[PDB]
Amino acid sequence: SMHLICQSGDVLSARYEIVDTLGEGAFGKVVECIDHKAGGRHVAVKIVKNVDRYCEAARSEIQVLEHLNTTDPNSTFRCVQMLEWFEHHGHICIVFELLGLSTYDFIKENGFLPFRLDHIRKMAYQICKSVNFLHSNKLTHTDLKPENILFVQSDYTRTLINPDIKVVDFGSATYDDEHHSTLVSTRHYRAPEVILALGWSQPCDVWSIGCILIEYYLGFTVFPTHDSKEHLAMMERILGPLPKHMIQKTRKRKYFHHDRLDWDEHSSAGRYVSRACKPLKEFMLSQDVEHERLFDLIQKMLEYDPAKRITLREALKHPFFDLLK
């Protein structure tokens, strides 16, 4: 098991000495190491489970990282830098520059207190610029979520001093000309064209970013569900009814009666959705214009039609970012 090879004091690749576990995910774990062959630099090493699905994603991630890091050697667009990779007792291990805490861990460890709006603005801008760089290079991330946005530095007292981020986890990233998996994204961040199996591309990341920004603002998801039908019902309650053209195209005709979701609003699930969800703008905590600007951007990211949906190039110009400029 991975447990036998990921302990503090263990030495990987004859140079990386584990000093701590940073986090875990479905894929394995990430550990902080001292690199004895780079003057004691601390690095992060992602130790990948020895399971086909995850080995395959790691191999994919290595190839995407080699491309992105070569294309952007200064990390101007804030994708994490891969230093090397190796195998250890049959596990793929990817070595990265050491970043700080995930945005998820930060919010969680603060009891789900939301980020300050000023920090949201800076973070949102950087996420948009980073993912736009993927988009420019015929890539879609597909698995954006707060866990995959990390702070660059440990620049906090937790109270944040500088909110600079990088994007991680390129194990699901897909090239335009590549086989597109049927199911992508973590459910709460998954776009409607994904759910409805309508085909997806870069716009599905923009949907995911909208969902991230809501979460940073509120401390919680507006899609608190583990079911696809209920997810769609929540969308309807927050954003209005889905477009006819999307309903008519879906092979998932089951879900709809005459271009309305086949959903009993008076059932237990129906009552739950009516309580937890409401029109997007009603979640605003202030009527101040900077909050209205954020919510206007989020509404455009959560456009149902992936063609009409704002692009990240466009998002970077939105009025919400004017305080940075």
Ligand SMILES: Cn1cc(-c2ccc3occ(-c4cccc(Oc5ccccc5)c4)c3n2)cn1
């Ligand atoms: C998924 N992934 C994570 C990395 C990566 C690359 C460089 C890093 O420098 C510090 C961390 C790190 C800091 C706190 C928690 C943490 O654990 C995680 C983070 C995300 C998903 C699950 C576990 C990792 C770190 N993580 C690359 N791919």
